[PDB]
Design a protein around this ligand. Structure first.
Ligand SMILES: Cc1nc2ccc(-c3ccc(N4CCNCC4)nc3)cc2n1Cc1ccccc1OC(F)F
Lengths: 139, 148, 131
């Protein structure tokens, strides 16, 4: 009996310039058991504990002040507010690479919307698959 | 209403009110204890033996670089019921400053590992420089466990 | 639990390679050729961490990669991947994890480019759990 747990694993679009845009219609990417992708956000179908996670990979050629941020955020349907669940900031300054992996476990409610965002889509690297992704897993 | 997991889990966050310290909270938006995990005297208390993922992120920040050399540490340690003394499980150390008389710098430190824990283990997550901790925003500083 | 599950750890005693030792292997999961073998079809959480250490910086530009690949029972495809540029000892972890639909017989690898910079506790591992 295949699992009926809500899950998603969405991957960023390498050819969407100036954007961090999530896709499910790609190999090894997934929306299942009720999770939707709407206006670049993952929409939670039932209340419960979830794992939530995201990775980005940044890359520059040398150093010109560069700040890199990555942030997962929650909009609760009741509260109608957008607040940071998981967030990091790096100041990296020959090519440099900065990956940022965020993960944690959270109580969410039906209708919650989650986003995963960055401040410098121009520094995103897409050289290989699996470098830039966003997901949730119902416990 | 699907069956909740009964696995012990916790994700606690820095108290953004407690400037100059690192105080973990579960009584805070988007922080949690479940299935027997407790937060007592700033430590996480394990309700049953087994493998757990233990993770923490802290974010340090400064305005330029000072005359004394800055060392930033983050340490997760274990106090077992059978040996009630802090033992380091995970640690890291960073030197954010490698400035003539002031650009901000940020140093995020993540610690993660999978460990066999015992019932009643107390887990601490601690830094040496709370004066450099940044809680300008939620989601930056946290400490959690997930029983496998 | 009947769910396939594995958590394997790196041999701190191997020479310039990343060798996984079984740590858990249960309910059909196997370790063959340093790869995990999927006993049945479905959703898996897959996760890994590796740690790197070096004493100071060299004149070769050091790039550290870590990558988890799916080898279809049916060819190797990245599922999860990252890269760090480390350049006084320095220390750098790389940590990965996500949820994937897999098929009976798929193999999974967890590899690095520079085993000579491995740092060897409770922190170098590879694993899966059926959801
Ligand atoms: C880098 C890493 N190391 C890991 C080690 C273990 C697990 C993990 C997380 C959950 C879990 N289960 C099975 C047991 N009950 C809880 C769900 N089992 C294992 C996740 C791990 N991750 C990735 C990760 C970290 C923090 C939160 C979520 C994570 O993974 C997932 F979200 F992709």
């Amino acid at each position: 009996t295949p699992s009926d747990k809500p899950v998603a694993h969405v991957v960023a679009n390498p050819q969407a310039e100036g954007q961090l845009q999530w896709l499910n219609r790609r190999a090894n990417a997934l929306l299942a058991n009720g999770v939707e992708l709407r206006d670049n956000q993952l929409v939670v179908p039932s209340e419960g504990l979830y794992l939530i996670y995201s990775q980005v990979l940044f890359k520059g050629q040398g150093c010109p002040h560069v700040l890199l941020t990555h942030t997962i955020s929650r909009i609760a349907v009741s509260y109608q507010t957008k607040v940071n669940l998981l967030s990091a900031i790096k100041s990296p300054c020959k090519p440099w690479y900065e990956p940022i992996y965020l993960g944690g476990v959270f109580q969410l409610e039906k209708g919650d919307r989650l986003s995963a965002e960055i401040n410098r889509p121009d520094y995103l690297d897409f050289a290989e698959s699996g470098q830039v992704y966003f997901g949730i897993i119902a416990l």
